[PDB]
Amino acid sequence: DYLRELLKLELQLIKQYREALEYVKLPVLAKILEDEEKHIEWLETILG
Amino acid sequence: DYLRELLKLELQLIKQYREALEYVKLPVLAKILEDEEKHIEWLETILG
Ligand SMILES: [Mn+2]
Numbered sequence: 001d002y003l004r005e006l007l008k009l010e011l012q013l014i015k016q017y018r019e020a021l022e023y024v025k026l027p028v029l030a031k032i033l034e035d036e037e038k039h040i041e042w043l044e045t046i047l048g
Numbered sequence: 049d050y051l052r053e054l055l056k057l058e059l060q061l062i063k064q065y066r067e068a069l070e071y072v073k074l075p076v077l078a079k080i081l082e083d084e085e086k087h088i089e090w091l092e093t094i095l096g
């Protein structure tokens with residue numbers, strides 16, 4: 001579950017990232033997004 | 049403040065990351081940590 005909990009925060013994280021991106025074209029914001037998306041696939045992979 | 053709010057979630061994120069790392073030697077967990085740490089410096093840089 002610890003792993004679910006992180007998958008949960010990350011998923012909460014991106015949304016807020018994506019919110020900013022509805023409004024501002026800030027490439028560094030889009031670049032964090034991309035890592036978290038990676039970050040979230042590893043979680044899913046290791047959750048099975 | 050939107051930027052503070054993200055700096056805030058990230059900071060909340062790592063802690064939970066670091067918690068797992070007190071217990072488990074999972075290199076992929078340590079590798080996320082590292083990105084978020086980057087993720088957090090960009091925030092600080094852009095917060096000024
Ligand atoms: Mn992440």
Ligand SMILES: [Mn+2]
Binds near residue numbers: 032036058084087
């Ligand atoms: Mn991050």
